[PDB]
Amino acid sequence: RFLKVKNWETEVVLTDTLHLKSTLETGCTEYICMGSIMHPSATKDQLFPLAKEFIDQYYSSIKRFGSKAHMERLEEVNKEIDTTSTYQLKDTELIYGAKHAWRNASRCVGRIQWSKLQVFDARDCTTAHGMFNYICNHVKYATNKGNLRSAITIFPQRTDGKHDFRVWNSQLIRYAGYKQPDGSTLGDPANVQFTEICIQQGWKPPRGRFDVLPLLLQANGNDPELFQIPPELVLEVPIRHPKFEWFKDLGLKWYGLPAVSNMLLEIGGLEFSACPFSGWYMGTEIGVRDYCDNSRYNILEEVAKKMNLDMRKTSSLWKDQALVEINIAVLYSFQSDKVTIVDHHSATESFIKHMENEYRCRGGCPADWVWIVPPMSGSITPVFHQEMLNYRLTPSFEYQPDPWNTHVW
Amino acid sequence: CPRFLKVKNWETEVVLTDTLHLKSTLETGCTEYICMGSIMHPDVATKDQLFPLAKEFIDQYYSSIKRFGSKAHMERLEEVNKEIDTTSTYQLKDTELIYGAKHAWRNASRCVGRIQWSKLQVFDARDCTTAHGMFNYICNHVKYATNKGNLRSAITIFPQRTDGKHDFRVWNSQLIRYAGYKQPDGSTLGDPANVQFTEICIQQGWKPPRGRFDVLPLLLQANGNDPELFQIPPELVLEVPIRHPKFEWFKDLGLKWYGLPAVSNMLLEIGGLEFSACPFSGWYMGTEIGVRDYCDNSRYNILEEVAKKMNLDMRKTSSLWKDQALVEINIAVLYSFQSDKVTIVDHHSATESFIKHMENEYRCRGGCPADWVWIVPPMSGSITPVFHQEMLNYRLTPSFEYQPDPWNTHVWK
Ligand code: HEM
Ligand code: HEM
Numbered sequence: 001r002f003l004k005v006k007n008w009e010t011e012v013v014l015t016d017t018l019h020l021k022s023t024l025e026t027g028c029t030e031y032i033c034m035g036s037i038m039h040p041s042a043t044k045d046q047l048f049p050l051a052k053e054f055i056d057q058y059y060s061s062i063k064r065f066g067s068k069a070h071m072e073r074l075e076e077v078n079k080e081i082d083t084t085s086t087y088q089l090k091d092t093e094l095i096y097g098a099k100h101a102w103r104n105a106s107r108c109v110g111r112i113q114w115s116k117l118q119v120f121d122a123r124d125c126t127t128a129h130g131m132f133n134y135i136c137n138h139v140k141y142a143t144n145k146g147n148l149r150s151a152i153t154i155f156p157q158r159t160d161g162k163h164d165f166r167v168w169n170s171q172l173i174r175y176a177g178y179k180q181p182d183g184s185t186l187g188d189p190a191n192v193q194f195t196e197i198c199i200q201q202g203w204k205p206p207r208g209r210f211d212v213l214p215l216l217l218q219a220n221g222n223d224p225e226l227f228q229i230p231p232e233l234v235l236e237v238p239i240r241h242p243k244f245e246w247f248k249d250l251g252l253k254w255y256g257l258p259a260v261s262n263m264l265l266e267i268g269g270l271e272f273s274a275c276p277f278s279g280w281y282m283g284t285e286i287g288v289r290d291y292c293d294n295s296r297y298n299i300l301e302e303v304a305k306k307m308n309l310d311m312r313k314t315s316s317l318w319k320d321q322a323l324v325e326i327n328i329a330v331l332y333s334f335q336s337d338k339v340t341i342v343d344h345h346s347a348t349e350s351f352i353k354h355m356e357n358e359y360r361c362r363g364g365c366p367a368d369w370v371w372i373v374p375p376m377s378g379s380i381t382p383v384f385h386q387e388m389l390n391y392r393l394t395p396s397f398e399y400q401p402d403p404w405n406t407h408v409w
Numbered sequence: 410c411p412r413f414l415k416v417k418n419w420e421t422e423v424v425l426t427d428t429l430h431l432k433s434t435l436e437t438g439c440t441e442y443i444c445m446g447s448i449m450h451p452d453v454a455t456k457d458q459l460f461p462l463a464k465e466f467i468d469q470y471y472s473s474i475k476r477f478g479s480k481a482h483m484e485r486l487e488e489v490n491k492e493i494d495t496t497s498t499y500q501l502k503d504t505e506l507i508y509g510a511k512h513a514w515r516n517a518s519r520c521v522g523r524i525q526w527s528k529l530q531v532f533d534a535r536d537c538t539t540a541h542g543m544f545n546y547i548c549n550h551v552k553y554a555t556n557k558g559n560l561r562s563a564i565t566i567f568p569q570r571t572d573g574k575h576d577f578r579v580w581n582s583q584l585i586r587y588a589g590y591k592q593p594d595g596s597t598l599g600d601p602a603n604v605q606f607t608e609i610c611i612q613q614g615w616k617p618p619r620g621r622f623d624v625l626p627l628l629l630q631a632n633g634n635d636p637e638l639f640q641i642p643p644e645l646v647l648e649v650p651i652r653h654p655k656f657e658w659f660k661d662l663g664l665k666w667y668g669l670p671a672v673s674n675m676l677l678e679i680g681g682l683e684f685s686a687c688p689f690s691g692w693y694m695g696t697e698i699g700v701r702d703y704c705d706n707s708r709y710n711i712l713e714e715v716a717k718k719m720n721l722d723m724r725k726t727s728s729l730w731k732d733q734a735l736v737e738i739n740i741a742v743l744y745s746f747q748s749d750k751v752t753i754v755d756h757h758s759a760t761e762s763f764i765k766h767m768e769n770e771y772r773c774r775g776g777c778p779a780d781w782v783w784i785v786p787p788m789s790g791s792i793t794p795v796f797h798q799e800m801l802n803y804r805l806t807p808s809f810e811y812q813p814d815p816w817n818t819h820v821w822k
């Protein structure tokens with residue numbers, strides 16, 4: 001069942017064989033496509049086949065399939081599940097698994113970097129203070145004074161679901177959001193809820209536009225605890241425009257390190273509920289989504305006024321104009337501060353090249369066109385014209401529910 | 410399949426509930442293990458295949474006019490059945506034809522303009538027998554729809570397929586398009602998208618002006634005969650010269666586009682009947698011209714030339730010089746059309762209308778199939794409301810379908 005994907009601009013056709021190695025669902029059926037749905041719908045006996053699957057591909061990946069080492073590992077993992085209802089990955093396997101979860105992440109346009117990932121093993125962590133220490137080291141390592149380095153820190157795997165390690169923040173670094181008396185919103189409205197949970201727990205908010213949230217860390221199923229990231233570890237960039245000297249007066253800033261902390265890493269049937277990972281920003285993430293989404297910072301109107309645009313009718317495309325200038329400013333600011341960032345043209349171009357490598361060496365590359373195509377200037381990037389196949393490979397990063405919906409104190 | 414599927418809008422938190430997907434009649438191409446949502450494209454029906462297909466449609470029609478189960482309903486069923494049994498096909502009443510065409514549009518998941526679905530002038534050309542007659546019908550379509558700039562959506566429907574060796578076909582992908590010419594040096598003049606078709610017209614006897622914006626002749630096939638060339642009267646072809654409200658130099662690019670987008674190569678399927686020639690037209694969303702026609706690399710590819718005249722730094726991609734030029738080009742397209750009083754809609758207005766449309770459809774029909782990949786405009790996606798709208802895609806009938814290009818299948822006489 002070979003499948004072709006065509007690029008309609010280059011006329012290049014690639015052939016997908018890798019999709020046959022999928023066992024998990026996408027949500028679509030033969031009659032309904034859920035391609036634009038954000039979130040479409042263990043035990044001993046469940047655990048061994050999954051473990052065996054993963055061990056098999058690991059030893060296949062290192063070109064020693066059926067080897068002496070392979071056979072022993074299967075036997076070892078088998079006995080361990082049998083006696084403990086779970087098992088422990090070797091260090092090599094942990095690293096392999098984390099890199100391959102990134103490699104398999106269909107929504108990520110940054111996967112050309114997949115094999116360059118610093119993996120921090122934190123599976124010996126037992127307390128929230130421990131988690132905080134590991135997270136601080138992660139932030140300091142990955143930030144690297146502006147020359148950002150991809151990293152992931154991995155906390156103890158789930159056991160019975162009652163003793164989960166969770167990073168309650170959705171990212172290690174985010175700005176707080178405050179509901180104002182007049183019903184408006186101060187700061188980042190995405191984090192309004194979380195921000196209030198921090199307030200409720202003892203955090204004293206400066207009530208500003210860009211207040212770095214505290215860490216809320218839960219170890220071994222216990223109540224979460226508050227920690228302030230040492231500010232010298234938090235790299236931030238003042239946004240300015242290279243032509244418009246009034247732009248700095250907007251008072252905008254963003255942090256340099258995007259560090260997603262609320263996903264679940266699944267490897268060989270094992271679940272890692274706390275696995276903050278980080279790379280670096282594509283400019284549009286901040287410039288289009290964080291800044292210009294109606295339900296986020298929502299600055300288009302303000303910027304539009306400073307550029308003195310006619311805002312009476314949509315067909316003047318004043319929004320599109322303002323959107324481009326904002327995104328120029330973000331790239332300029334980060335570059336001028338020697339902080340790693342990628343523009344959407346460069347990123348999408350690297351992704352097409354990555355796709356080509358993957359088809360050539362791996363027989364395909366799962367990819368989610370809905371997420372891959374940038375949220376501005378879509379068809380002037382090469383991925384718009386790229387047919388992609390989406391399918392779920394393991395190891396993977398999965399969504400999990402917010403901890404405050406399932407945690408009793 | 411579950412009876413209630415929910416879609417969420419991530420900007421407004423509005424949740425809608427779809428039940429209409431249960432009426433889905435054909436395959437998307439996806440399976441449970443793979444999604445083909447970004448794939449562009451993922452001899453006749455026997456008596457027994459035709460019976461349920463026809464009954465399905467007739468039931469739907471009589472349900473729509475609140476006469477389901479009526480004597481007229483059962484009579485129509487019995488008459489259709491007899492007709493299939495004695496002729497292996499059947500003929501649609503004018504009322505059913507009009508309903509079916511409007512519903513094929515209503516069902517078109519890739520169309521952002523469907524709020525207008527129930528306002529569609531249908532021209533019944535099922536009495537057409539020759540290519541000259543097809544030409545007459547098409548000229549009348551163009552003039553009515555153009556309406557001196559005040560465009561009116563319309564479809565003209567030619568006779569349905571019979572044995573498959575007598576198809577009516579418009580060979581043109583749209584009624585109005587510009588020629589493309591491959592040069593000996595590898596460069597292209599005009600629209601690179603139309604090179605192949607242009608070549609065919611030239612072989613058929615067309616004398617090409619060999620310019621940048623040469624309107625192509627119609628290449629019309631009636632009753633399965635070899636196709637024939639016809640020139641559309643130029644006074645019927647409304648065109649807009651592109652200028653920019655600020656940049657005086659923009660008119661010097663010698664750009665223009667035609668006013669009427671009129672897809673002419675799709676197949677219209679109603680109650681199992683196949684109308685292989687059904688040119689239809691609405692009006693343009695600006696980005697269709699300003700982003701795709703003008704800025705695609707494989708199309709007119711003008712970004713560079715515009716950026717140069719704007720004197721942009723074009724060395725660092727991170728200057729976003731492409732993005733900056735793209736916006737100006739789209740501003741010029743909208744300004745030129747509005748100035749010449751030719752109907753056009755910007756992508757903000759269109760997508761906002763589609764959201765209101767989609768909500769109404771979920772309310773009154775239990776759903777609205779939509780293809781997010783197509784519905785989200787090719788620029789500024791995130792700042793239009795559709796980007797944030799979860800959509801369910803599925804294929805309802807009647808529908809517009811793709812069909813192979815006629816020169817690939819035609820048996821030359
Ligand atoms: C190194 C530079 C990287 C770049 C430029 C990059 C780029 C992106 C972008 C732009 C998105 C879309 C996010 C959004 O729109 O909200 C994304 C998604 C994603 N990325 Fe990457 N990424 C990078 C590194 C990484 C790393 C190191 C990992 C994991 C180890 C990773 C895993 C993921 C996952 C799982 C998603 C899906 C997020 C979701 O479903 O919410 N990425 N990436
Ligand atoms: C009245 C104003 C209309 C507007 C603003 C509009 C808008 C659009 C746009 C922007 C597209 C995407 C085209 C592309 O990117 O190639 C599209 C596709 C489509 N439209 Fe509409 N449309 C209109 C009228 C109509 C009518 C009258 C019909 C049929 C009766 C129709 C049926 C379709 C179909 C079948 C597609 C899919 C085209 C394909 O798959 O190539 N539209 N429409």
Ligand SMILES: CN(C)c1cccc(CNCc2ccc3ccc(N)nc3c2)c1
Pocket residue numbers: 110170171258260261262263278279280281282285399
């Ligand atoms: C609920 N959830 C999983 C969540 C939480 C925060 C943000 C998001 C959206 N995904 C954003 C994201 C993820 C990974 C990235 C890696 C690199 C990069 N530059 N940006 C990323 C953005 C979802």
Ligand SMILES: CN(C)c1cccc(CNCc2ccc3ccc(N)nc3c2)c1
Pocket residue numbers: 522582583670672673674675690691692693694697811
């Ligand atoms: C079937 N095929 C290959 C084909 C032929 C011509 C054009 C296209 C792309 N679809 C363009 C289209 C379709 C309907 C429209 C309705 C209104 C409008 N303003 N634009 C439309 C563009 C594909």
Ligand SMILES: C[C@H](O)[C@H](O)[C@H]1CNc2nc(N)[nH]c(=O)c2N1
Pocket residue numbers: 036037038370371372419796797798799800
């Ligand atoms: C409804 C739709 O799935 C949702 O808005 C998606 C669309 N594409 C996206 N693409 C990226 N990269 N990030 C996102 O958050 C989204 N949101």
Ligand SMILES: C[C@H](O)[C@H](O)[C@H]1CNc2nc(N)[nH]c(=O)c2N1
Pocket residue numbers: 008384385386387388446447448449782783784
């Ligand atoms: C690969 C991808 O499916 C292809 O480029 C699509 C994307 N979405 C589109 N959307 C519209 N409206 N028109 C198009 O031609 C396309 N092309």
Ligand SMILES: [Zn+2]
Pocket residue numbers: 028032033034035439440443444445446
């Ligand atoms: Zn799908």
